[PDB]
Amino acid sequence: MNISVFDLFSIGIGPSSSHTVGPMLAANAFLQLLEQKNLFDKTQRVKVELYGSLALTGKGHGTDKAILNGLENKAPETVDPASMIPRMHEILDSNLLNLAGKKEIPFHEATDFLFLQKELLPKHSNGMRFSAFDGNANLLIEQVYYSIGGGFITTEEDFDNPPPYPFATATELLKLCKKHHLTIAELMLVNEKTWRSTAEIHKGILDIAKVMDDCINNGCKHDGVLPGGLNLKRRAPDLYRKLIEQKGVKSVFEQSDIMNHLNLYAMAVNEENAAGGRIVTAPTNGAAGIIPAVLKYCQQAHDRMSNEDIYTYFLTAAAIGILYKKSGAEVGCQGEVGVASSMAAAGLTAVLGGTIEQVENAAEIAMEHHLGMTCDPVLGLVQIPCIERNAMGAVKAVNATRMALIGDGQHQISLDKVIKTMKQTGMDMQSIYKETSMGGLAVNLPEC
Amino acid sequence: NISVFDLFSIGIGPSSSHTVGPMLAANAFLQLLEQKNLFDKTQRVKVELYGSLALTGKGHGTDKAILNGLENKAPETVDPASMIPRMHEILDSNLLNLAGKKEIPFHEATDFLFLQKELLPKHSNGMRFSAFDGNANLLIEQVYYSIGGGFITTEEDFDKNPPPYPFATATELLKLCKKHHLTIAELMLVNEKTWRSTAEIHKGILDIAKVMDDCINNGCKHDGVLPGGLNLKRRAPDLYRKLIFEQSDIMNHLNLYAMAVNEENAAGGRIVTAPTNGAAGIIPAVLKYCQQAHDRMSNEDIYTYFLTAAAIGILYKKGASISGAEVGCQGEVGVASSMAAAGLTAVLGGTIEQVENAAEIAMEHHLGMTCDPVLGLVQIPCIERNAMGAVKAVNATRMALIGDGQHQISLDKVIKTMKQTGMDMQSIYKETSMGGLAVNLPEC
Numbered sequence A: 001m002n003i004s005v006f007d008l009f010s011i012g013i014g015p016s017s018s019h020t021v022g023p024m025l026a027a028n029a030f031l032q033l034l035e036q037k038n039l040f041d042k043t044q045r046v047k048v049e050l051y052g053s054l055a056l057t058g059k060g061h062g063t064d065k066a067i068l069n070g071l072e073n074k075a076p077e078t079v080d081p082a083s084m085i086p087r088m089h090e091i092l093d094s095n096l097l098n099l100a101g102k103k104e105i106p107f108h109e110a111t112d113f114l115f116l117q118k119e120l121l122p123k124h125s126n127g128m129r130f131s132a133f134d135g136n137a138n139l140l141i142e143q144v145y146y147s148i149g150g151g152f153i154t155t156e157e158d159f160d161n162p163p164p165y166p167f168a169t170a171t172e173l174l175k176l177c178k179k180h181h182l183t184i185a186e187l188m189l190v191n192e193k194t195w196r197s198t199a200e201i202h203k204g205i206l207d208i209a210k211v212m213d214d215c216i217n218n219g220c221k222h223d224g225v226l227p228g229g230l231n232l233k234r235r236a237p238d239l240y241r242k243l244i245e246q247k248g249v250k251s252v253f254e255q256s257d258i259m260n261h262l263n264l265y266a267m268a269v270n271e272e273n274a275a276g277g278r279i280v281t282a283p284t285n286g287a288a289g290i291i292p293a294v295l296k297y298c299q300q301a302h303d304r305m306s307n308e309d310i311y312t313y314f315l316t317a318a319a320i321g322i323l324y325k326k327s328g329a330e331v332g333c334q335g336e337v338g339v340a341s342s343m344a345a346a347g348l349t350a351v352l353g354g355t356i357e358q359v360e361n362a363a364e365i366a367m368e369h370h371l372g373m374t375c376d377p378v379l380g381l382v383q384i385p386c387i388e389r390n391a392m393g394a395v396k397a398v399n400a401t402r403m404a405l406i407g408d409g410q411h412q413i414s415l416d417k418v419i420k421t422m423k424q425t426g427m428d429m430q431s432i433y434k435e436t437s438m439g440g441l442a443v444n445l446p447e448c
Numbered sequence B: 001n002i003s004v005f006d007l008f009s010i011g012i013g014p015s016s017s018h019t020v021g022p023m024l025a026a027n028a029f030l031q032l033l034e035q036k037n038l039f040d041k042t043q044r045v046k047v048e049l050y051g052s053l054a055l056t057g058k059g060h061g062t063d064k065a066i067l068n069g070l071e072n073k074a075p076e077t078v079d080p081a082s083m084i085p086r087m088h089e090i091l092d093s094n095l096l097n098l099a100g101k102k103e104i105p106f107h108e109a110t111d112f113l114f115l116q117k118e119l120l121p122k123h124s125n126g127m128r129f130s131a132f133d134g135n136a137n138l139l140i141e142q143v144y145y146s147i148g149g150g151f152i153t154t155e156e157d158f159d160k161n162p163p164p165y166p167f168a169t170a171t172e173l174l175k176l177c178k179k180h181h182l183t184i185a186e187l188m189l190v191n192e193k194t195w196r197s198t199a200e201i202h203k204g205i206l207d208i209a210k211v212m213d214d215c216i217n218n219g220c221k222h223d224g225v226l227p228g229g230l231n232l233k234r235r236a237p238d239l240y241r242k243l244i245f246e247q248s249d250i251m252n253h254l255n256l257y258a259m260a261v262n263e264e265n266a267a268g269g270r271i272v273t274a275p276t277n278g279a280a281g282i283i284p285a286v287l288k289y290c291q292q293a294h295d296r297m298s299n300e301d302i303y304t305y306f307l308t309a310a311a312i313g314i315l316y317k318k319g320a321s322i323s324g325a326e327v328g329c330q331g332e333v334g335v336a337s338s339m340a341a342a343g344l345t346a347v348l349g350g351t352i353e354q355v356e357n358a359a360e361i362a363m364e365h366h367l368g369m370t371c372d373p374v375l376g377l378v379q380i381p382c383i384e385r386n387a388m389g390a391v392k393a394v395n396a397t398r399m400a401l402i403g404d405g406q407h408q409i410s411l412d413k414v415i416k417t418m419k420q421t422g423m424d425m426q427s428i429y430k431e432t433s434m435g436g437l438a439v440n441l442p443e444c
């Protein structure tokens, strides 16, 4: 298996890769299967069934909203986030769905959109079935999809091009860099060029950077109360006014320093995510705050930041991502926010001039400081503790960087060891369950 | 029952369990020889180190500590600079100046044993002091266990009066504060007056702070390479000169102060537990940042800091059996961070709820953290964990305050998860080269 920077960082929408983006793509792919199989013209009814962990937290994650819009051919990277709620409301009030954006058809939630919290499909807990029927109520087709993380999906029947410098461990990564006289980012570039041209790769990285920067500004401006039931006030816009626009009275805890700026940038992004705005996974929507907050700090700190520093930051980040990833890859929040902090740490460190060993050392400290972190967020939403974790995660990633540079790389433990610990604490998590009000499921599976 | 002064005790580094404890055991063994009036007849003392105490005692200077402690040096007061030379003289001259009074022969090959492969039955950090007469007859032997924080217990006492507002949970501490109309600091002062007077509590807190402040200063000056064999260079001095990636900001100062302290600890300097020697850098680092970023802190603020910190520490410690309390580094570095966030939060004017929320977040960002340091020394990853720990405490404080307390999970639930990850660590073993014992038992 080959993993790309563009697998780790993808443009979609919030609040959840597993529960928002994946089901929206599964819906898009259901439309395509109707075409493939020549059943679209006969189809006069669609039915959606959500199982297990999709059904239990789907409402708070906008799974229904994502799927309904996706059935009209809205894609998560391009849909207008502001349209999702009004459009969903229109479909349900009017009992009509514009299937594939080509054909209106009747749609009744009582029979057509079911939440089966107490049933499971057997490959994975994030399961759904789509069904289409003719005007005579005959079943034309059914298809089960699993949302397996990051917004990737598979069919039930699919559930179970080599680059020049492939690597599976931290140790093999250093060994290859040494032997070919490359940085971590340079080695990555060579690998990414197996699948794309240098100009695709470079353009893809700046697009990601631009969307992150817009999401930060959107977060800084959108006052509001988050949905889903915690009445969680968005904090980033007031904090923006205090620290950037010199309005209102700074509290004793609201000083304008490096840390509260990391806080501002991360919370802005994760607040957008929770609200359903455009988001770049990094590597998931839940962990999305950390990488841009850090990149943005890096920008405000050295305004001679070049395009090549930006490439290096992303490719270095990607490399570390790969170490951790390369479907029972579910290891709790450490495999998301943890991996985001480690990636960001490694990127900043490479850009600030660390050796190969210091880049790993930095990643290692950042991860160390998340080992064991589970996913049991309050009511199922990507809000508490998720939002405070990205802030906390941005700050840890900068400090891990500082430890690795100030420490001259001395304060280090093998990154391969820290990855082994991630994987074992992750397995142990299969036996720790949420409250049976949250459905009594294991805490190794990310909600985001 | 637990006192602010139980968690913050003046001593010497690198380790509460391996250096301060065994020193107080020797001190106690001398007092047992006075008490049973066997000191006159004593011509030989013999020390045997067992288990996890032997495994890493050399790196933790347990030998140095025990030999100075057999001369009635005490961890609170010894000149730390006198520990190494004085041990060399004892071993080079084959002569132990017992209790400072009487000079006896001392032969390390028979009288100082490291028994790495054997265990005493109660606990892994156990020792035995024996005294013998001129004819090689046992006068008396006494097993001690060093069970954390520098506390000791004899073998017979191992398996074994109350304040007005006792609390065992985060929840109780809130109920009592609302009911009786008191901040956490004020309820703590009330509880602490059970054993001391106000002016002792107050003077004792101020003494702790002074030693912490001197400890930071010392670390900011003492250039060097740390002992034990990782050739770990001290970074606090350069950093201090540079702040007078090297940005001179809130973060690099927290780093500076925490590393100053933990480097002093690793080098064997004077150190105040908080709650352990290995976790020593966090609380002072946060206190100094607090002092530097607002008005000259009043003495009351300082009282509020330490007493608010201590209540959080008690939530973690209370009602725990000696083995239950062993929950890896989260139980030491984690607890310091949580304690420091809580104290900073109360000084800065947070509600009871926000003080609890900040403690909660700080501990959350340490859950499952094990004790498995490199070669067994209190260096790696111990030093970066205190820098990191000070940073998370301040930031946990911000989260609680900027979030107006909304970003909260119950502290009781985080405290419980601490315990079960702790329990699970009993089956996670260090490498065979470090002795194969579990990673839940703090080395520091």
Ligand code: SF4
Pocket (backbone or CB within 6 Å): A286, A287, A332, A333, A334, A336, A337, A374, A375, A376, A377, A381, A382, A383, A385, A386, A389, A446, A447, A448
């Ligand atoms: S908690 Fe679960 S959901 Fe919230 S961020 Fe960590 S992983 Fe994503």
Ligand code: SF4
Pocket (backbone or CB within 6 Å): B276, B278, B279, B328, B329, B330, B332, B333, B370, B371, B372, B373, B378, B379, B380, B381, B382, B385, B442, B443, B444
């Ligand atoms: S690692 Fe073990 S020794 Fe180093 S601090 Fe944490 S607990 Fe104390």
Ligand SMILES: [Cl-]
Pocket (backbone or CB within 6 Å): A115, A116, A117, A118, A119
């Ligand atoms: Cl059901």
Ligand SMILES: [Cl-]
Pocket (backbone or CB within 6 Å): A010, A150, A151, A152
């Ligand atoms: Cl994708």
